[PDB]
Structure formats: C-alpha cells, structure tokens
Amino acid sequence: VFHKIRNEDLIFNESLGQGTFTKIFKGVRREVGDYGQLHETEVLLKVLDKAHRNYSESFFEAASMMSKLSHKHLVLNYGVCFCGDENILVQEFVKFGSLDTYLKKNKNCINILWKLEVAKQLAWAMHFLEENTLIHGNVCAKNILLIREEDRKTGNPPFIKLSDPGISITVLPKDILQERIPWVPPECIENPKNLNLATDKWSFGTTLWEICSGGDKPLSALDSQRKLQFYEDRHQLPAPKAAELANLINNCMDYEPDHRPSFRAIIRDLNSLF
Ligand SMILES: Nc1nc(Nc2ccc(S(N)(=O)=O)cc2)nn1C(=O)c1c(F)cccc1F
C-alpha cells in the first residue's frame, strides 16, 4: 500500500503534457526524510481523473504491484495523493527524462556501445519482472528514463530506469491499443485477454528498434486501420538505423508468442555483441 501524501505537501510547477488518460506535471514534495530532515524533493506527478474509475483502479494497482518489487532499474514511487476529484501518483523525477526525447535532443550522437548498455539494463529489468511473473505491458522508449548520462572519464555507462506500467491494455479502448501498434503485440490486438509475459518480449523488440533508430517511432506514417492491417498481413519492422540489433529485434518480435526468447537468453545475446 502506497504511503499517503497530503495535497498540502505538493506544489505543482510545470505542465509536462499528457499520458494515456493522465496529466503529467513536475512539482515539489515537502517531506520529512532520513533523520527527520525536512526536504523539498523534486517529483513527477501523474494525475488520474477519479471519474474514470476503471482507468484509475488499473493504473494504481499496476503502479502498486510493481513498487512492491524494489529494483535499481525500476522507477521509485513515493506514494499517492487521494485528493478529491483526482488520484495522483507521486514519483521520482528522473533528471534526463525519456530516452526517445533524449536521443532526439542529442541528435543520435551516441555510439553502439551506449545503445547496448541501455538495452542490457532494460533486459535485466525485464528479467527481474519475468522471474516475478509480473507483466509490465507498456514497454517503450518513452518509458525508459535516463538517470545519468555516460561519463567517459570514469567509464560509467548511462543508467536507466523503467517507468510505471500505466493503465492496462486489458481495460483500454481498442482504438488506443491500435494506436499503440507495434508496441502492443498482434495477439493482444486479436484479444486483449492474450496479455502474457510474452507481451513484454515483443514490446522490448519494438523498444530496441526505437533505441537504434534515434528515437524515431516505427510505423508512424500508418494510421490505426493500416496498423491493424500491418499485423493481419504479418509484416515485420524494417531494420533500424543501427543494424547491429536487427536480428535481436526480429527474434523478439515473433508472431508466435511462445517462441519469443527469455530475457535471460536476450541478455546473453546482448553480451555476445561485445
Ligand atoms: N518519472 C519521470 N521523470 C521524468 N523526468 C523528466 C520528464 C520531462 C522532462 S522535459 N519536459 O523533456 O525537460 C525532463 C525529465 N519523466 N518521468 C516519467 O515517468 C514520464 C514517462 F515515463 C513518460 C512520459 C512523460 C514522463 F514525465
């Protein structure tokens, strides 16, 4: 159960747009921290409309279930504000933000080893979720958050965390799931009850394509109807700009869910590319 945070201890400072039936803000939390030290902590606030009851329930159950699993590559949730007409997730603010935006702002001037390190970290996170039989369901480059940039002097790689799952595809409207092709796998377009650990293996492939494509979105030129037909016709994505991961992407984006490799196997594959 999430720690409750009082509306009175939250300041909203900056609008950061919208997620899927969410409004996102940067703000500050006034808290009592380690040793009774008063802190003013930068926070990321995700606001759900209480009137969208099934969406909110799904969102906060997903966030809660994953926050029960502390992990270096999973975002820290501080708690929730049940304040009136809205329920608010209070989350750590990750300094360098979403990986797709990061790659655009840096004009894809990162080398293949940087991409491999981020891919490995994501794979380790997903391996941990797989061992805990916890489906994420919204793996994508925008939900990869950069804590730290690479430091060439120390050899430190970039360091990432994976965002909270959001509203489950089992409750979202079909048109939203179709918009989310090709992150949502074909079996889930067919029936959202086909959600399975296999789902995240497919989406991991799509996310690798993003990482290797400088933050481009695959199939952006296709509308919801032509994306649904892209699966009906069983097409695969084009090889990304950095072709080094093309084989791994194809192996993960397997139309047969049971053939998608384990994240343990995926990690070994990534290691062998170096
Ligand atoms: N927890 C979290 N921290 C951030 N850091 C952030 C956000 C925006 C910027 S900006 N306006 O480009 O300069 C810079 C740093 N994002 N974040 C999220 O969960 C998050 C997400 F996963 C997807 C989309 C939006 C988010 F907000």
Numbering used by the authors: 536 to 809
Question: What's written in the study?
Answer:
JAK2, like other JAK family members, comprises a catalytically active C-terminal tyrosine kinase domain (JH1), a regulatory pseudokinase domain (JH2), and a Src homology-2 (SH2)-like domain that, together with the N-terminal FERM (N-terminal 4.1, ezrin, radixin, moesin) domain, forms the major receptor interaction moiety. The JH2 domain has a key role in mediating both negative and positive regulation of JAK kinase activity and numerous disease mutations locate in JH2, including the prevalent hyperactivating JAK2 V617F in MPN. Previous studies have demonstrated that JAK2 JH2 binds ATP and possesses regulatory autophosphorylation activity on Ser523 and Tyr570. To gain insights on the compound binding modes to JAK2 JH2 and to analyze whether any differences could be observed between binding to WT and V617F, we determined the crystal structures of selected small molecules with JAK2 JH2 WT and V617F.
The TSA screens identified six compounds that induced shift in the unfolding temperature of recombinant JAK2 JH2 V617F at or above 2 °C, four of which were identified from collection screened only by TSA and two, JNJ-7706621 (1) and AT9283 (2), from collections screened by TSA and FP. JNJ-7706621 (1) and AT-9283 (2) were also observed as JAK2 JH2 binders in a previous screening by Puleo and coworkers. The initial hits 1 and 2 possessed highly JH1-selective binding over JH2 on JAK2, whereas JH1-selectivity of 7 was minor. Compounds 1, 2, and 7 also inhibited viability of MPN model cell lines HEL and SET-2, both of which express JAK2 V617F (homozygous in HEL, heterozygous in SET-2), and murine pro-B cells Ba/F3 carrying either hJAK2 wildtype or V617F at submicromolar-micromolar range. Structural analysis of compound binding modes to JAK2 JH2 WT and V617F mutant revealed no major differences in the binding modes with the exception of compound 1. 1 interacts with the side chain of Ser698 in the WT structure but in V617F structure this serine assumes two conformations and instead of interacting with the serine, 1 forms a hydrogen bond with Lys581, which is shifted closer to the compound. In addition, 1 forms an H-bond with the side chain of Lys640 from the αD helix. This interaction is also not present in the WT structure. Differences observed in the complexes with 1 stem from the conformation of the Gln626, the αD lysine and differences at the back of the binding pocket. The variation in the hydrogen bonding pattern in the back of the pocket (Ser698 in WT vs. Lys581 in V617F) might reflect differences in the dynamics of the pocket between the structures but altogether the differences in hydrogen bonding with 1 is not reflected on IC50 values.
